[PDB]
Write a protein that binds this DNA or RNA. Structure first.
Ligand SMILES: Nc1ncnc2c1ncn2[C@@H]1O[C@H](CSCC[C@H](N)C(=O)O)[C@@H](O)[C@H]1O
Length: 350
DNA sequence: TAAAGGATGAGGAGGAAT
DNA sequence: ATTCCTCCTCATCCTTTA
């Protein structure tokens, strides 16, 4: 019966104790290829037990990205990578709101005692929520504190929608460029393409903390001095490719599988705007990626050293009121598509 | 038309008390 | 072992607005 580690540091995180540098892996789980699977920590019961059983009985490494950025992100990671000698990307991240939001400390009330944000999700707060808070707060301007029933009203709203103070009585949601930076993506990683404000939030919410993922993938730089070939499944906006690019690891080849067309364009822009030299091949529906094209691409470029992906959490995530059904759900079922591909790659890389 | 706003809880986790 | 309380959570669906 899996239980979550407290504190949620996995095998360790920078600037905190509890670090562990070696672990036992079932002989069956040992690579090649290396693989890395991400998904949400807080699931319905029996989900991580099922997932771990299908990934060779590898116990998850649970990490809260509050040890890598200002916002929380309780994630479970499963992988067959070494743990010794991890390092992190520079520059060091901004861990507290005071550091990440320095144009805000003029406007920050002292009865808002938050130093960290909640999890960046797909749905963000409204412009009218902002006005409701301001009109509830302009009466009390001369007075050093509003009444406590009113403090409780706005404070609960701020924690619900991850608001930050941007002016007098003005508590606004994050902007995309602010989510991109908290998550490790370069600013306007998602701007290109006529992308709507709403659609950028949905794609940013379904994303990696780059710092967190990169700290796990650091261990690949000294062992692949000439670069790697990546099979990136459920790619999204390229959290894993950005992790590797920030690690300064050459991506000879990236086969990416992503059903959304604007996501695929985001990664293609990032590929061209970073003047990358390797090749980017893009597939859409993973259910239509046959084993034949997999081994055909393996016979041509010489195997995949890394298989990275995060399955859909739509049916596991607690924000879902309708279809929190587990791995039985129409989208999170696609986890077994991840295993299916990794078995094909394993069959040739053994 | 395309984008934004608003309505819709369950379900555990993690404390702090016995 | 228990109970009791506060909090958080890669979201779906329908209606309104420009
Ligand atoms: N059938 C399918 N085939 C391929 N990708 C799919 C798919 N169904 C959903 N997806 C994709 O899986 C992703 C869910 S998780 C997104 C991963 C995360 N945003 C990252 O950067 O790693 C979505 O981005 C979605 O477009």
């Amino acid at each position: 019966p899996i239980r979550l580690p407290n504190p949620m540091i996995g095998f360790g995180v920078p600037n905190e104790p509890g670090l562990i540098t070696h672990r036992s892996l079932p002989e069956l789980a040992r690579g090649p290829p290396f693989f890395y699977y991400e998904n949400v920590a807080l699931t319905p019961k029996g989900v991580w037990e099922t997932i771990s059983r299908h990934l060779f009985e590898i116990p998850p490494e649970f990490v809260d990205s509050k040890y890598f950025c200002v916002a929380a992100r309780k994630r479970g990671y499963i992988h067959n990578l070494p743990i010794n000698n991890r390092f992190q990307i520079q520059p060091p991240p901004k861990y507290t709101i005071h550091d990440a939001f320095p144009l805000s400390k003029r406007w920050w009330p002292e009865w808002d005692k938050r130093t960290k944000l909640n999890c960046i999700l797909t749905c963000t707060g409204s412009a009218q929520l902002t006005n409701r808070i301001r009109v509830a707060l302009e009466p009390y301007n001369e007075e050093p504190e509003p009444p406590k029933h009113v403090q409780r009203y706005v404070i609960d709203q701020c924690k619900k929608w991850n608001l930050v103070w941007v002016g007098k009585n003005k508590a606004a949601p994050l902007e995309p460029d602010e989510m991109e930076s908290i998550l490790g993506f370069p600013k306007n990683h998602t701007r290109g393409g006529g992308m709507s404000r709403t659609e950028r939030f949905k794609s940013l919410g379904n994303s990696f903390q780059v710092d967190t993922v990169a700290y796990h993938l650091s261990v690949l730089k000294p062992i692949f001095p000439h670069g790697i070939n990546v099979l990136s499944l459920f790619t999204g906006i390229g959290g894993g490719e950005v992790a590797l690019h920030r690690l300064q690891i050459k991506m000879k080849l990236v086969v990416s599988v992503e059903i959304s067309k604007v996501n695929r364009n985001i990664l293609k822009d990032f590929w061209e705007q970073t003047n990358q030299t390797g090749e980017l091949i893009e597939f859409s529906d993973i259910q239509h990626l046959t084993n034949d094209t997999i081994e055909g691409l393996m016979e041509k470029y010489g195997g995949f050293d890394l298989v990275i992906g995060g399955s859909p959490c739509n049916n596991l995530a607690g924000g879902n009121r309708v279809s929190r059904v587990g791995l039985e759900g129409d989208q999170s079922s696609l986890f077994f598509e991840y295993c299916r591909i990794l078995e094909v790659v394993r069959a040739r890389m053994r």
